[PDB]
Scaffold this motif. Sequence first.
Motif, PDB file in Angstrom:
ATOM      1  N   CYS A 109       5.422   7.046  -2.083  1.00  0.00           N
ATOM      2  CA  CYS A 109       6.785   7.581  -2.226  1.00  0.00           C
ATOM      3  C   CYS A 109       6.795   9.086  -2.486  1.00  0.00           C
ATOM      4  CB  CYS A 109       7.530   6.871  -3.358  1.00  0.00           C
ATOM      5  SG  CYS A 109       7.781   5.105  -3.105  1.00  0.00           S
ATOM      6  N   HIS A 115       4.163   3.133   4.014  1.00  0.00           N
ATOM      7  CA  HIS A 115       2.994   2.293   3.768  1.00  0.00           C
ATOM      8  C   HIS A 115       1.832   2.705   4.639  1.00  0.00           C
ATOM      9  CE1 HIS A 115       6.194  -0.290   2.121  1.00  0.00           C
ATOM     10  NE2 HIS A 115       5.250  -0.611   1.252  1.00  0.00           N
ATOM     11  N   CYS A 168      10.329   5.521   1.231  1.00  0.00           N
ATOM     12  CA  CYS A 168       8.862   5.420   1.036  1.00  0.00           C
ATOM     13  C   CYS A 168       8.172   4.883   2.289  1.00  0.00           C
ATOM     14  CB  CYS A 168       8.500   4.532  -0.163  1.00  0.00           C
ATOM     15  SG  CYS A 168       9.289   4.997  -1.723  1.00  0.00           S
ATOM     16  N   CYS A 228      11.985  -1.963   1.329  1.00  0.00           N
ATOM     17  CA  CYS A 228      11.854  -1.061   0.186  1.00  0.00           C
ATOM     18  C   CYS A 228      11.474   0.351   0.623  1.00  0.00           C
ATOM     19  CB  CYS A 228      10.886  -1.657  -0.832  1.00  0.00           C
ATOM     20  SG  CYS A 228      11.539  -3.210  -1.528  1.00  0.00           S
ATOM     21  N   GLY A 229      10.701   0.448   1.701  1.00  0.00           N
ATOM     22  CA  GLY A 229      10.377   1.750   2.261  1.00  0.00           C
ATOM     23  C   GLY A 229      11.613   2.441   2.791  1.00  0.00           C
ATOM     24  N   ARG A 235      10.918  -4.012  -4.859  1.00  0.00           N
ATOM     25  CA  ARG A 235       9.921  -5.054  -4.583  1.00  0.00           C
ATOM     26  C   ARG A 235      10.028  -6.214  -5.560  1.00  0.00           C
ATOM     27  NH1 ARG A 235       7.207  -6.662  -0.882  1.00  0.00           N
ATOM     28  NH2 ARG A 235       5.057  -6.366  -1.619  1.00  0.00           N
ATOM     29  N   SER A 278      11.202  -6.805   0.840  1.00  0.00           N
ATOM     30  CA  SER A 278      10.017  -6.667   1.679  1.00  0.00           C
ATOM     31  C   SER A 278       9.522  -5.235   1.696  1.00  0.00           C
ATOM     32  CB  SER A 278      10.335  -7.120   3.108  1.00  0.00           C
ATOM     33  OG  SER A 278      11.239  -6.247   3.750  1.00  0.00           O
ATOM     34  N   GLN A 279       8.290  -5.035   2.147  1.00  0.00           N
ATOM     35  CA  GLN A 279       7.739  -3.688   2.218  1.00  0.00           C
ATOM     36  C   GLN A 279       8.602  -2.774   3.101  1.00  0.00           C
ATOM     37  OE1 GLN A 279       3.579  -4.280   3.301  1.00  0.00           O
ATOM     38  NE2 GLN A 279       2.951  -4.247   1.152  1.00  0.00           N
ATOM     39  N   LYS A 301       0.876  -1.213   0.000  1.00  0.00           N
ATOM     40  CA  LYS A 301       0.000   0.000   0.000  1.00  0.00           C
ATOM     41  C   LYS A 301       0.894   1.238   0.000  1.00  0.00           C
ATOM     42  CE  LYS A 301      -3.853  -2.289   2.319  1.00  0.00           C
ATOM     43  NZ  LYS A 301      -4.274  -2.670   0.940  1.00  0.00           N
ATOM     44  N   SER A 302       1.795   1.272  -0.979  1.00  0.00           N
ATOM     45  CA  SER A 302       2.997   2.102  -0.918  1.00  0.00           C
ATOM     46  C   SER A 302       2.777   3.564  -1.291  1.00  0.00           C
ATOM     47  CB  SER A 302       4.079   1.503  -1.825  1.00  0.00           C
ATOM     48  OG  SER A 302       3.588   1.291  -3.139  1.00  0.00           O
ATOM     49  N   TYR A 355      11.294   2.003  -5.484  1.00  0.00           N
ATOM     50  CA  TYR A 355      10.429   1.094  -4.725  1.00  0.00           C
ATOM     51  C   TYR A 355       9.974  -0.113  -5.538  1.00  0.00           C
ATOM     52  CZ  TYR A 355       6.695  -0.806  -1.792  1.00  0.00           C
ATOM     53  OH  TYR A 355       5.915  -1.646  -1.002  1.00  0.00           O
ATOM     54  N   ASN A 356       9.445   0.137  -6.732  1.00  0.00           N
ATOM     55  CA  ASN A 356       8.961  -0.957  -7.578  1.00  0.00           C
ATOM     56  C   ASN A 356      10.047  -1.971  -7.945  1.00  0.00           C
ATOM     57  OD1 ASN A 356       6.407   0.170  -7.485  1.00  0.00           O
ATOM     58  ND2 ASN A 356       6.584   1.150  -9.495  1.00  0.00           N
TER      59      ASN A 356
END
Length: 42
Positions: free
Chosen positions: A4, A34, A32, A26-27, A17, A22-23, A1-2, A13-14
Amino acid sequence: KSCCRNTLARNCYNACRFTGGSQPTCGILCDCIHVTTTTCPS
Ligand SMILES: [Cl-]
Ligand SMILES: [Cl-]
Ligand SMILES: [Cl-]
Ligand code: NA
Ligand code: NA
Ligand code: NA
């Protein structure tokens, strides 16, 4: 549910992933976040 901060960070981010990240990873790596809502903060 990202969410950026800009498009450079969005691509970050994409790709992160897609190649196995993992979320939270990548955040962290792409600056970024969530959310459990349907939209992001400006
Ligand atoms: Cl995850
Ligand atoms: Cl990870
Ligand atoms: Cl996160
Ligand atoms: Na992944
Ligand atoms: Na995790
Ligand atoms: Na992590």
